[PDB]
Automatic annotation (TrEMBL), chains A, B:
Protein name: acetyl-CoA C-acyltransferase
Enzyme class at the top of the EC tree: transferase
Family: Belongs to the thiolase-like superfamily. Thiolase family.
Domain (Thiolase C-terminal) ranges: 274-396
Organism: Thermus thermophilus (strain ATCC 27634 / DSM 579 / HB8)
Amino acid sequence: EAWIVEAVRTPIGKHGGALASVRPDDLLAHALSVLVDRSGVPKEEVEDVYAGCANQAGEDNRNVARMALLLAGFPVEVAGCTVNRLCGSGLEAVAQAARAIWAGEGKVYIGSGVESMSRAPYAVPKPERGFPTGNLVMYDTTLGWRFVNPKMQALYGTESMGETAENLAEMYGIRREEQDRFALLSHQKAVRAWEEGRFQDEVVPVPVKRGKEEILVEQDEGPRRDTSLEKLAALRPVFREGGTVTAGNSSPLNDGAAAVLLVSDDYAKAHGLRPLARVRAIAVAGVPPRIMGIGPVPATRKALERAGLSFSDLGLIELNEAFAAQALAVLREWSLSMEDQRLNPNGGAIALGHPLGASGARILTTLVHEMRRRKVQFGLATMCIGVGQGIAVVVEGM
Amino acid sequence: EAWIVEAVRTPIGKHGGALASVRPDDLLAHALSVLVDRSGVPKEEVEDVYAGCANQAGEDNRNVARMALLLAGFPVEVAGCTVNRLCGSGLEAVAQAARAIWAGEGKVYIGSGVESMSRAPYAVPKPERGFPTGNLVMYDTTLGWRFVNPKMQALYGTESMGETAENLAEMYGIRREEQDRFALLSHQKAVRAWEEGRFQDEVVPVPVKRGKEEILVEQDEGPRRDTSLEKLAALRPVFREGGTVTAGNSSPLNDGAAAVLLVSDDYAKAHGLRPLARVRAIAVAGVPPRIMGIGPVPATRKALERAGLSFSDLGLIELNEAFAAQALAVLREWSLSMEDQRLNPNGGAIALGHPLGASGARILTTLVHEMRRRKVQFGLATMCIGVGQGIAVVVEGM
Amino acid sequence: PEAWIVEAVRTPIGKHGGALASVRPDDLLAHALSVLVDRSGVPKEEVEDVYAGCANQAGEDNRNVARMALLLAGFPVEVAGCTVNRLCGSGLEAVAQAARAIWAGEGKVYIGSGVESMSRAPYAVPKPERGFPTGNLVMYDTTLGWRFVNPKMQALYGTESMGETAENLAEMYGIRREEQDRFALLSHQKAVRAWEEGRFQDEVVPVPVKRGKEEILVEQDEGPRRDTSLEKLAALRPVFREGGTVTAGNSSPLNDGAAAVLLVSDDYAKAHGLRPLARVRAIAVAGVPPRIMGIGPVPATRKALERAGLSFSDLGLIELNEAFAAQALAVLREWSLSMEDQRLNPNGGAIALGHPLGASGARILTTLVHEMRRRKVQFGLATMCIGVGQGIAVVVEGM
Amino acid sequence: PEAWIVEAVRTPIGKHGGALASVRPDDLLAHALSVLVDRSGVPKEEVEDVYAGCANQAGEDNRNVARMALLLAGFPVEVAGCTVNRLCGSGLEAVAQAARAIWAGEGKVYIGSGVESMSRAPYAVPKPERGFPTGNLVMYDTTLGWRFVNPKMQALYGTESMGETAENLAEMYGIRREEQDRFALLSHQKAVRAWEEGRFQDEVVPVPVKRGKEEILVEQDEGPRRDTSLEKLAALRPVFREGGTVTAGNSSPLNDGAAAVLLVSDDYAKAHGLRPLARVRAIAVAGVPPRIMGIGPVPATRKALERAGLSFSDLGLIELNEAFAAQALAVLREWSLSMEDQRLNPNGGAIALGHPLGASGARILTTLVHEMRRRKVQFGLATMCIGVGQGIAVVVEGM
């Protein structure tokens, strides 16, 4: 009933990098425009546009989805909503789109996500008294915990994502050598994937204006060919003294956008749209904040169950790489080796980038396209989510 | 299949008023706590929490749903996500919940919303160059357009909600006397509803700490008994010189939170939960930004059609009052009189308050409760949405 | 006699966010400047330059308030102006600056003044040093103290708050809690009594405050409290050091206020029939260790007295700014004086009246001069402690 | 002859966000202060008080930079300090203040300095006056000019920028674009020539800058450019008024820098064998209409010369701060002097060298004194225009 007929993503840029000049609302518009243009489905046919965004305080404020779809030239009739389940917002957007199609409402929906961590603004508290006294803090929304709630600090901590990654490394006994090794592979597969043209179909270039002339960013600037196991081992822990998680075996902060077009099976048939995949089942689940990294475990088991499938039926697995330590802990639960041919075949977030709000849709796009070329029947896309959550979506190729 | 077994809301406070000292995440936690406590449904039974929020830049940052549920004592397994479709986010949250139950994922979901416009922080842009020069702006997130996109400015304007209200008053020729008359009714019906105890069931008191001692806020502080038709006419236009929209015939800025508990029919039967109503159909639609006030029209039409009903089958209608002018324009299309006994029976946003993010769930709460007491079969909850959108939900009493 | 004080005025002192919080510093100072000249009978065009003290010039008091204020007050464009800043003692430095110019034989008419609007002090935000930064920033409240701290500074001397330096002194001189509060109770009583008996009617000039549509006239310091009791004072908890002694009650508050004094050359005074209020005898500035800035008046007063060829015993009126009961008493310890001395802050001190930083210096000088005239005292001393370790003192001879 | 200038030093002048943007003002000024005393052979404990000029004390230069800088520089705790602010002329005002104290027979050793780091000037934010406000706020960049504008001010005189008042002057005196660019070109050539020939080696003291892990030594003003041409200068577009004449090229930039001069009493100099560089003859300050603040030097130079009992023609060396080619030339008109005058800014002016506000006053006095000594001139003049309508001048006699 819910079919994925098109998937697109802008390349992923480094923080303050290649796409730091492009504002989120404009960035997402590029994705939305490109999705529809190559699909051959008039914009006017889209019923509603769901988009994921982790921080809607800056140029992405007041419902990016609606702002972006308008900017992209869609007719005024197309609706939009911005969903926010942090790291997993991108996937939640697709889930939301699918559920609508299943409910027999619209026939054409878009599931997307965007996040410009470079341009994330500062948030400043409002005074509560007349002529205050005392310094104030300007919170950088690019980062994490802010406007902290004392009651929150008391119930669970406010440990950084990086810290929870260490908590996992401890719990599962994931050594530094293994973390860096996992990281090296992410880079190697990504570099190889680009080099061999596997990203050419799903990636749509983004024009950047540098002063007077335009530049065309058309490749993720994250992957490095010179990544070596020696250099990776030279980096210092960054979240815990005498720790194990370093800047090299964890994802960076990035800018990016992704969008997938979903239509009802009947609609696809009536317009000759060739399916890329079909949404089989979705699941969401919560885990303790201190170890939000394993969120994919219970989410994937619930999803597989709902799709009446076994992990072993999966032929391609997209597990978002928030931290090597976290990803490996998840792999432990699944009894899988980082060398598994099905796992992040073209690289993961450690090398490609983790533009929060957009990653969910980003990884589903990479999954679907790869599923098609190697004709895999079942694929999984799942991510860990900040403050203790997980989301997973099971897709069936066609 | 998707049943509404409980609905609650905190009273609505004026800007910088009775609830200005309560932070959004905490406010929403009160609603979430109350919802389950009265239901007799253990927290661990909830599958996911959807919550709407128009501005997630302050104490409501990084997914308030998840933050709120944890603060409210829910176990770590309960998931949560924050939806944002501006003014209509509250309703989008319920729709989201319903579609999940229909998809047969979980059996217990919460659809809610929160908005503390009193504590909305300031947003400051990030520097793009080394040692800048020139003044910067601190955008007040309590208001409207910010970090404006030039392209947006060119395609459609960045007129304020209040201005779009005028555009409608002009388009439909809705006089000032008519608008103020409409506003007077909102107050009278609200004052009456409270006075007669119709809000007693749906409202849960919120404790506010004033220094050392606690005070219990237990009534909306918006409605005023001394509201007169003369006073209303003495106000000056606020959005357009020689205009018609005044601070008196338009909604204010407020703080508030609301939550509705939906459960699958099979679950309700297994646990003896008595249904308040059933979710029949949902519809979302877009309209030109310059007259977003009309959003309810195409959305209500789509929803009714999807529920296979006619406007005349409706026995109670909750049309959020963003502006007298806008509501009346909507009434024009429906060929309904502001005196219709089915319309906002206990008052509307002009007198009660419009805590953005929470309004959707807020009016749904008021609808369901009134539907039950007057044994109405079909009810409609619909609202206009910023930058040109509209959402509507048809519900069947039980 | 070369530099003569011929007029002294001050606006009432308001509480933080209080009665004058609505008035901006530049405008407030203008009121003082305008009033000083109006009642003097000396045309504004006669003034040579205007010195003014201001501890924080980041907000509405930016870019030399002196000049802004004077123009606002209707002075002709020819009158010059400069804003001096020696923190807590800026107000007095302003007067000293004026006197020294008159002695140098430059102009014949100068104004020494000060202003401080602690209520409207803005926030200061650092500038980015890199392209697309990352990390939280801080908005420093200029109403307070240490900000944009320099590591090197932190290393050499601390960055202990004024309140803490008060404690350091209470400890060093063993100034008990009962003593401190007793001293504070007196400040209030003398102040309440002085107002009550009209001793402030001459030196104070009412300030019009606009509340919405109508104007209100602020004409009395809102700091002094008749209900101040030794019981209440003792019930307050230390504010700067756990198990300490300095409370919010035995320390000065944060206030808004402005004051200005008109000085002229003696030959000018004689040529225009201006009756002298007093004559500036000697000035002295001195530094002391930051951690106990409170004693600053000590070395400064000895230097000033010596320069005026006088002994402490020749003083018939002493205005010692009350930054903290503990700090004042420590100074009194050095001078071997009792807080009961009839010469000491006869009409109350900052603890009860207020300490609008930049204006305090000129504020106490104004109160000294006026009281010197009514009780016909020959020698008066005005001295204050200054933040980060300094002290200033000015000796004046009545006429 | 009671006030003698025995030593003069200045740090090089950096561009906005340039070579010294990493150094904080308080630290920058400490360099000047340390350097001044180290080469004078006068123990720090001998210094009585330290005056410093600073146009914006809202950032790292808050709460009396003089006292912070002197402590940072290692001076003993007893040395006092105060920050004076007369905007563009604060640097000079600091020396004047030092001199006047020596004349009054207070201390024997004083320091007059100035500092300004326009690169790190913070942002200033207003304080809310109501509980839960609504409406956007503004973050004023203290690097610039008018801010927290007073409506009343706007109504009496405008709030025209310095650059604008430079145009008003250009118009009033009919100073053509070609003339302005020519003046600007000479400022660069004389500056480049001066450095190249080593005339700045004596007065300039290197500033160590930390660049990550290693130190770099900034030792030359980074403003002057050898490649400055009359053709390039003419290519620039007006920056303050459409179809105007003032360009970024014929105006001074925004810069960072610090300077300090050591003044001592004549009897002290004699008793310790200090060789005088110059003698402070007379000082004068004056106000002019804000819209044409550029001419401030005229009435101030007149009053100063008159107080020194000299005639303009007796001046053998003239340092007129170059705020704007247009402003400087208008002043030159009043004096009936040609920009070719061999006495005028011999080693270059602000347009090429830089205008680090608060420090420029002391900076130009330093360059004047040193040049006076090498070419054995007897009388020199240092004068500047001051924001919002003022001017200051100081007459010095070589020795």
